[PDB]
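Lab notebook, bench 4. We co-purified these components, and the gel suggests they stay together. Before we commit to crystallization screens, I want a quick structural picture of the whole thing.
Request: model the full complex, all chains together.
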Amino acid sequence: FPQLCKFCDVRFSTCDNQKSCMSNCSITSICEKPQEVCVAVWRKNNITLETVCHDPKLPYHDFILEDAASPTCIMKEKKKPGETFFMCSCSSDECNDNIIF
Amino acid sequence: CCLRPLYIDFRKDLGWKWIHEPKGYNANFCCCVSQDLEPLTIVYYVGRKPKVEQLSNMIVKSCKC
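Here is the predicted assembly.
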């Protein structure tokens, strides 16, 4: 059965130094494949937060989702060069509304 | 056995998280059984695609005893 994990794409965020910030996204989606999974990425130059629904076999941003089955999203640095880069992945339904660091 | 007014707020009562808008609607509740129903137009997303569709049997109208 397909998940709902938020698909609000790239957005400018007030997320900063707090342990956990909420996706202020207005749309909850019915993921296009039952296999899929949400991810939330929070790249820090200003800061953009990205929330989509994704597939655990496919790589995102040339990275691969190893904790894709975890029930609540958790961000770890992926050390993309030149930027602060964080990513996570859900197995729950609209996981990536609350990001935990 | 006369019609009645009730309000329902998808996320906070039915528990449906997939509906984008509306947040709720007024369906009515009728013992007296519901006679006539009608559909509710709603909006929701499959991935990022937004789509429109009527959900039939959402709004009650006539009551029959």
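The beta strands of chain B are 33-34, 37-45, 50-60, 63-64. Worth comparing against the SEC data before the next meeting. The longest strand of chain B covers residues 50-60.
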